Design a protein around this ligand. Sequence first.
Ligand code: 2NC
Length: 203
Amino acid sequence: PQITLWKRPLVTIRIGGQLKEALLDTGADDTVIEELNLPGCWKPKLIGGIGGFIKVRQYDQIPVEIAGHKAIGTVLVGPTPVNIIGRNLLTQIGATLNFCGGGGPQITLWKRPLVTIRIGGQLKEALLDTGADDTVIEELNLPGCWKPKLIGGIAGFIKVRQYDQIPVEIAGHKAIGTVLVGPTPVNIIGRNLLTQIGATLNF
Ligand SMILES: CCCC[C@@H](CN[C@@H](CCCC)C(=O)N[C@@H](CCC(N)=O)C(=O)N[C@@H](CCCNC(N)=[NH2+])C(N)=O)NC(=O)[C@@H](NC(=O)[C@@H](NC(C)=O)[C@@H](C)O)[C@@H](C)CC
């Protein structure tokens, strides 16, 4: 299919013989699912995101059907806020990110989808994250009025400053919208701006 990003890219998956809902997440290296039992042995791991880290159980070589497409790979199980399908399985099902519906660059998911952005007259690197509702940029002295906000990721919540109507050029494509500024470990471009540049998931 081709999936646009006006809504969360939620899909049904089948795993261990059970159906679950999960978010297609280009900003996640790995696939993380809420607590459940999986056949096979597991080992302890920690994974991170906004706010730090959680403990998970790593299961290897798990079959997962994702919208009807087969994958067999690593599934982390633990207290994630949302079930996410990460790049390890997205690559198996042939998923790419495409600008302007495929008229623009195609970004494969073998490595983190990092691109150059321009914001407040600065160039920065940022991750295209279909699993992010909002755009979050590392602490940056933007002039202007802001409102406080809290946003939440794998390890908890962080406090950010919300600025509205900020232009953000993404790989040469002009967007304008809300930007959150705070202590993120990676600058994140979320769906609010991805939709403006016609970015789609395709597989
Ligand atoms: C879990 C909630 C949905 C997925 C997540 C994907 N975000 C990326 C951000 C990338 C880092 C800043 C992420 O968590 N990626 C993880 C996913 C876990 C995983 N293992 O794949 C990752 O790749 N982690 C790497 C990064 C390294 C961590 N640090 C380190 N090694 N030192 C890792 N392998 O642990 N989205 C979010 O965290 C966003 N949250 C949301 O969009 C929504 N919030 C919630 C609570 O659902 C909305 C309601 O606010 C944040 C950014 C606010 C807009």
